[PDB]
């Protein structure tokens, strides 16, 4: 089911989370590091879906920087309106 | 930051397809990691401060949540 | 395809909510005998040994 690598991943979590923490190392759940991961993955797919659908609308069918920078600014939107 | 460089080009690739993508720019994976970066950033910070919130110095799954539950409502 | 498009973002978007209140359900559990993972080093154990998250068993018990 996992898309990315668990390790890369934990260690970007890991780098992420230290700077929280003194520079001391809080140590996780393996549930919550799969946590943590599952919810990015379905962000980023999600993510994906709608800038792609820009894509689509646009004409084309490679995704391209400017169709993600537009789907981030309308789950702004979204998320500001309803 | 040689970390988010880590997430890999066929992860990316991976990813994009599942979200129904059939062809990327090559200008889409920094794209995706600075995403991830911001996503990371905002769900840890409140995991983590969460933890600590609750004099803990594991962070749980249930911690997690938490920060999904914040992340999702902001 | 302007209407279609704002269909298939509210569609969209939904899918997203069924699948985060989905993963919040599932997560939101002690889960008090599972194994911890060592940050500091990205370790941790198992019945087999001593093994890398995501990584090889890296000690045999």
């Given at each position: 089911?996992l898309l ?11 780098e ?18 799969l946590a ?9 797919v999600h993510?994906?879906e ?10 084309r069918v490679?995704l391209?920087?400017?169709?993600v920078?537009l ?5 702004g939107?979204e998320?500001?309106?309803? | ?8 080009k ?13 062809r990327?720019?090559?200008?889409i994976?920094?794209e ?6 911001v ?5 840890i910070?409140d995991?983590?401060?969460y ?6 110095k594991?962070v749980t799954a ?13 | 395809e ?6 298939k973002?509210?569609a ?6 069924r699948?985060?209140?989905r ?11 599972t194994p911890?993972?060592?940050?500091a ?12 998250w995501?990584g090889?068993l890296?000690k045999?018990?």
């Amino acid at each position: 089911h996992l898309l990315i690598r668990k390790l890369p991943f934990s260690r970007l979590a890991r780098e992420i989370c230290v700077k929280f923490t003194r520079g001391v190392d809080f140590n996780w759940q393996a549930q919550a590091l799969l946590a943590l991961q599952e919810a990015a993955e379905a962000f980023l797919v999600h993510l994906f879906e709608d800038a792609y659908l820009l894509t689509l609308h646009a004409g084309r069918v490679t995704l391209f920087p400017k169709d993600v920078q537009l789907a981030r600014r309308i789950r702004g939107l979204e998320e500001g309106l309803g | 930051r040689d970390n988010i460089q880590g997430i890999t080009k066929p992860a990316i690739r991976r990813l994009a397809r599942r979200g129904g993508v059939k062809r990327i720019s090559g200008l889409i994976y920094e794209e995706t990691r600075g995403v991830l970066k911001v996503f990371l950033e905002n769900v840890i910070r409140d995991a983590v401060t969460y933890t600590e919130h609750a004099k803990r110095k594991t962070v749980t799954a249930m911690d997690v949540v938490y920060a999904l539950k914040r992340q999702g409502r902001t | 395809e302007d209407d279609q498009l704002l269909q298939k973002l509210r569609a969209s978007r939904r899918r997203f909510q069924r699948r985060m209140q989905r993963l919040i359900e599932k997560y939101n559990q002690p889960f008090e005998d599972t194994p911890v993972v060592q940050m500091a080093t990205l370790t941790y154990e198992t019945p087999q040994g001593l093994r890398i998250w995501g990584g090889r068993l890296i000690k045999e018990r």
